[PDB]
Amino acid sequence: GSSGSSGTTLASIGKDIIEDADGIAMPHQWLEGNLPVSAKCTVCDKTCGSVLRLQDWRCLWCKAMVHTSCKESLLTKCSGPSSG
């Protein structure tokens, strides 16, 4: 006859810094509509501007206007709302 058992461990986690130390990648903040009168697509280079449609999307950080379809087409990454 011989037996035994024991073990007690605990841990508390939840918040984790989603920032790196090499070159964090920041997406583009697409804002439905809100396009200027002289708007322009940065993917296809076509006349844009949703006067009474408020559809066209445009980044607020890099300030890049793109179409709904062209959006997915865009590959380049964003820099951010501010760095220096």
Judged by the rule CB under 5 A, the positions of this chain that interact with Zn ion are 28, 41, 43-44, 59, 61-62, 67, 70, 78
> Rounded distance, CA 2 to CA 54, Å?
76
Min dist CB 16 to Zn ion, Å, is 25
The residue (of 13 and 31) whose beta carbon lies closer to Zn ion is 31
The angle at the Cα of 69, spanning 76 to 59, to the nearest 5 degrees, equals: 50
- Nearest Cα neighbor of 59 from 29, 27, 33 is 29
Min dist CB 8 to Zn ion, Å, is 49
The residue (of 4 and 84) whose beta carbon lies closer to Zn ion is 84
